[PDB]
């Protein structure tokens, strides 16, 4: 990502001023610049590189190269999750039916926040299953929006 930010943040980790940080700080550095890797992923990224594998510290250039060759896996750790959205629906689903009426959904989407229009909602609903009761399974709805 933005080398300007990445580079600045790198300096605050490089207290010895030796142009490199402890290999054990790699996870913290990657979290500080915006990613969310497990310890497993961080270790797998390092071992996948014989040159870095047994190194004691890592420079900015080495870390930048590591990011670029694992960019997709790292970007994926910041992807929106279904669970992040379900809260917008759950607050209003008092009985936890897991369903929202098409009327309430259109209201929420066109009346609040960065309002969508009826015409955007109409287009979206073509890909959405509506009950004979006019109800929509909201986790399924969120999963579909997020898929791809």
């Amino acid at each position: 990502s933005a080398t300007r930010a990445n580079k600045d943040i790198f300096t605050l980790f490089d207290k010895k001023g030796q142009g490199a940080i402890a290999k054990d700080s790699l996870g913290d550095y990657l979290r500080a610049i915006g990613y969310n890797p497990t310890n497993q992923l961080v270790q797998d990224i390092i071992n996948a590189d014989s040159s870095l594998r047994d190194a004691s510290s890592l420079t900015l250039d080495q870390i930048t190269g590591l990011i670029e060759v694992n960019e997709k896996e790292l970007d994926a750790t910041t992807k929106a999750k279904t669970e992040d959205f379900v809260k917008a629906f759950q607050v209003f689903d008092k009985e936890s039916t897991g369903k929202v009426s098409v009327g309430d959904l259109r209201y929420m989407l066109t009346g609040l926040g960065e309002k969508l229009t009826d015409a955007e909602v109409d287009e979206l609903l073509k890909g959405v299953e509506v009950d004979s009761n006019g109800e929509i399974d909201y986790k399924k709805f969120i999963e579909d929006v997020l898929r791809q």
């Binding site: 929106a80 992040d84 959205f85 926040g113 979206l124």
Partner: peptide, 25 residues
């Protein structure tokens, strides 16, 4: 946190919509 969550969802919908449009043209 509720209005922000709804706002983020609206953003993802809008991207979903533009994606669909790219496929027709």
């Amino acid at each position: 946190s509720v209005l922000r969550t709804i706002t983020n969802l609206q953003k993802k919908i809008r991207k979903e919509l533009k994606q669909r449009q790219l496929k027709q043209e």
